[PDB]
Design an enzyme around this catalytic site. Structure first.
Site, PDB file in Angstrom:
ATOM      1  N   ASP D  25       0.691  -1.256  -0.053  1.00 47.70           N
ATOM      2  CA  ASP D  25       0.059   0.075   0.122  1.00 47.70           C
ATOM      3  C   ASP D  25       0.933   1.318   0.071  1.00 47.70           C
ATOM      4  O   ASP D  25       1.293   1.656   1.063  1.00 47.70           O
ATOM      5  CB  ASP D  25      -1.043   0.077   1.394  1.00 47.70           C
ATOM      6  CG  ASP D  25      -1.817   1.217   1.394  1.00 47.70           C
ATOM      7  OD1 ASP D  25      -2.506   1.373   2.400  1.00 47.70           O
ATOM      8  OD2 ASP D  25      -1.639   1.986   0.416  1.00 47.70           O
ATOM      9  N   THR D  26       1.016   2.024  -1.172  1.00 43.28           N
ATOM     10  CA  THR D  26       1.893   2.971  -1.301  1.00 43.28           C
ATOM     11  C   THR D  26       1.184   4.242  -0.374  1.00 43.28           C
ATOM     12  O   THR D  26       1.764   5.229  -0.196  1.00 43.28           O
ATOM     13  CB  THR D  26       2.082   3.600  -2.753  1.00 43.28           C
ATOM     14  OG1 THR D  26       0.860   3.599  -3.505  1.00 43.28           O
ATOM     15  CG2 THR D  26       2.754   2.327  -3.246  1.00 43.28           C
ATOM     16  N   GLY D  27      -0.212   4.244  -0.120  1.00 39.19           N
ATOM     17  CA  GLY D  27      -0.804   5.250   0.837  1.00 39.19           C
ATOM     18  C   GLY D  27      -0.733   5.133   2.180  1.00 39.19           C
ATOM     19  O   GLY D  27      -1.198   5.704   2.830  1.00 39.19           O
TER      20      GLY D  27
END
Lengths: 5, 4, 99, 99
Positions: D25-27
């Site tokens: 998850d890059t967020g």
């Protein structure tokens, strides 16, 4: 979305 | 859906 | 072109004639923006995440430019802490996750 | 290995001797895992998400293998709907976004 807060 |  | 993850992957987007900053989020199935003015009609919907769930407005066929690349897709609008570009739009700008 | 986002970017992880699936998850600033047994001491903490906040246990210096690539770092454990690998670990395995 993960917010380190 | 899901915003993980 | 390419971006590392040492910092939050923030990009500039243009949507509904407005400029905003958004997070590229590979963990998000969908794109969700903070409250904003978006023309057209919408349909109710609910999305979840860590912490619980939020109610959002669902807008389809919405044009968005992400860091220069155009995409048309569904955009949710509601009480999210930050604008999130989800996989539904990430695939349109040929966003790949490589490691 | 390159990874497209037409589907959720799920990967296999090994942590605390156990095998689990997790979402890249890059967020996510931080890595958060569903309740599990981990050795060592921890310290309370609260992280935020789209639906609000959740309480979690914070563990440091935790070894994790993500798709064969080892990394050491902080791992949070609490009521998250799914196992999330956040940027704190993503940078250790050289992940990048490409568009």
């Amino acid at each position: 979305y993960v917010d380190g807060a | 859906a899901e915003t993980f | 072109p390419q971006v590392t993850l040492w910092q939050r992957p923030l990009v500039t987007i243009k949507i509904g004639g407005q400029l905003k900053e958004a997070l590229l989020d590979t963990g998000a199935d969908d794109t969700v923006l903070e409250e904003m003015s978006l023309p057209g009609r919408w349909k109710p919907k609910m999305i979840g995440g860590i912490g619980g769930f939020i109610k959002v407005r669902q807008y389809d066929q919405i044009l968005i430019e992400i860091c220069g690349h155009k995409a048309i897709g569904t955009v949710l609008v509601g009480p999210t802490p930050v604008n999130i570009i989800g996989r539904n739009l990430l695939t349109q700008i040929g966003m790949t996750l490589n490691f």
